[PDB]
Amino acid sequence: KAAAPACPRFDDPVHAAADPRVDVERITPDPVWRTTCGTLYRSDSRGPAVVFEQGFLPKDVIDGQYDIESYVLVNQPSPYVSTTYDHDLYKTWYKSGYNYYIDAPGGVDVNKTIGDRHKAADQVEVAFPGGIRTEFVIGVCPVDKKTRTEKMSECVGNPHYEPWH
Numbered sequence: 262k263a264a265a266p267a268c269p270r271f272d273d274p275v276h277a278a279a280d281p282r283v284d285v286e287r288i289t290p291d292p293v294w295r296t297t298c299g300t301l302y303r304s305d306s307r308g309p310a311v312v313f314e315q316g317f318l319p320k321d322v323i324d325g326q327y328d329i330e331s332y333v334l335v336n337q338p339s340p341y342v343s344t345t346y347d348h349d350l351y352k353t354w355y356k357s358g359y360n361y362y363i364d365a366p367g368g369v370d371v372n373k374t375i376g377d378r379h380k381a382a383d384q385v386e387v388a389f390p391g392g393i394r395t396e397f398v399i400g401v402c403p404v405d406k407k408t409r410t411e412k413m414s415e416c417v418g419n420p421h422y423e424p425w426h
Contacts (some may be wrong), residue, residue, distance in 0.1 A: 268298035269366070269426050273352055277314040278391025283340045287327040288390060293373035295387050298426055300399065301344040301363040304354035309401045312361065313419045314424040316395035317342040328407040329374055329388060333381040344368065350384060352409040360404055364424070365389065366396035396423040 272292050275283055285292075305312065319325065320338035332339045343361055351360040358408035402416040 266426075268296065270296065274367050275389075276379050276388060277367050277397050279318050279356045279394045280322050280340075280391045283319070283322045283391030284327070285390060287340075288369065290330075292329070292369040292390075295368045295370045297374075298366065299346070299362070300347055300348070301346060301365065301368070301387055302350060303342070303344045303361040303363060304351045304357035304359070304404075305361055306356070306358045309359065309417055309419070312398060312401070313395055313421060316335065316398060317361075317389070317393040319349060319390075319392045322391060329369060329371060330416050332388070333371055333386060334376070334379065335385075340390050341369070342392040343384075344387045344389060344393075345394075346385040346387065350410070351404050355409075356381045356406060358404060358406075359401045361401045362399040363393060363397060364399050364422070365393050366425070395419060395421045398422060399426075 299383050308357050318411050319342050322340040324330045325339040326337040368387040368389045372382055373389055399421045400418040402411040
């Protein structure tokens with residue numbers, strides 16, 4: 262065994278963005294950026310044939326909801342792609358077909374940015390402004406809806422994943 266090293270840090274806080282038109286100055290409140298580099302997760306019903314080709318693009322970088330609290334509590338079209346620190350959050354997301362595995366720098370740590378007292382705090386979210394390029398999507402495991410478990414023999418790695426640390 263070895264003690265883990267610190268994480269590489271990019272000067273650009275939206276280095277990972279799949280849509281670089283995102284306007285970081287429009288983020289409210291002042292974002293607290295994630296500085297760790299552990300695996301993150303995303304429940305999504307969209308299939309890996311799509312996500313592995315385009316990454317995770319956000320719904321609306323131009324006119325979407327740039328306020329983090331508004332976005333996490335009301336879910337309007339936004340510049341953000343939500344992810345979570347919690348590998349098991351898929352169990353609460355009923356009917357989501359897939360648990361995506363992500364290795365991406367940055368992202369806005371939601372609970373560090375707006376506190377942990379709001380109703381979405383248990384989602385321990387990290388919001389990626391501009392989304393997430395496919396090179397930072399490790400892979401995916403399909404979810405069995407009736408037992409809320411991963412179909413681990415059916416996990417698939419993203420051929421485009423590029424390890425960076």
